[PDB]
DNA sequence: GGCCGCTCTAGAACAGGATGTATATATCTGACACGTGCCTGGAGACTAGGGAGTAATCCCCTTGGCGGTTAAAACGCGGGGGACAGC
């Protein structure tokens, strides 16, 4: 991931797009979601790696602030596994 | 076209980290006792001279007695002032 996203976006990564590759939606979740989610998604865990799920809440250039809880359905578990499955499309 | 397997989500359990508190253990602190080494004082030895002790005699002082006189002490009595208790 790293590797991609420095090797086309460096120059600044919030120009990055996961582009021709469609990922699957998220499961019913509290919250809508999309391409767009996913990419700012995958830029928050470029900047603050993976697991560091408070900040990349927290950032607002991801528009995430609000999307994402603390019973509502999304949490880091599902965040784990929803960047497990954009990781392995994109390295696929 | 149908059913089962696989994947994802949800719940439950367990462990670890974080924080505060209590308890046990270690360390310090101090004084005494023993050992060691060195130096000084005491102990031992010997001599000479002075002081103390001993003896005798004499003189002065102290103790005891007598007598008289005078002053002091003791006994007595009354009144006043001070001391004591109270408030």
Do not use: M
């Given at each position: 991931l790293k590797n991609l996203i420095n090797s086309n976006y460096?120059?600044?990564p919030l120009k990055f797009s996961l582009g021709n590759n469609?990922?699957?939606?998220?499961?019913?979740?509290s919250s809508n979601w999309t391409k767009e989610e996913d990419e700012k998604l995958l830029?928050?865990?470029?900047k603050y790696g993976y697991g560091s799920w408070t900040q990349i809440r927290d950032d607002p250039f991801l528009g995430?602030?609000?999307?994402?809880?603390?019973?509502k359905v999304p949490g880091a578990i599902?965040?784990?596994?929803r960047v497990d499955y954009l990781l392995s499309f994109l390295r696929g």
């Amino acid at each position: 991931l790293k590797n991609l996203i420095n090797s086309n976006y460096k120059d600044d990564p919030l120009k990055f797009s996961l582009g021709n590759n469609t990922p699957k939606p998220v499961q019913n979740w509290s919250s809508n979601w999309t391409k767009e989610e996913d990419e700012k998604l995958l830029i928050g865990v470029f900047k603050y790696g993976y697991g560091s799920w408070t900040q990349i809440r927290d950032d607002p250039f991801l528009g995430i602030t609000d999307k994402i809880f603390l019973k509502k359905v999304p949490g880091a578990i599902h965040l784990g596994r929803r960047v497990d499955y954009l990781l392995s499309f994109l390295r696929g």
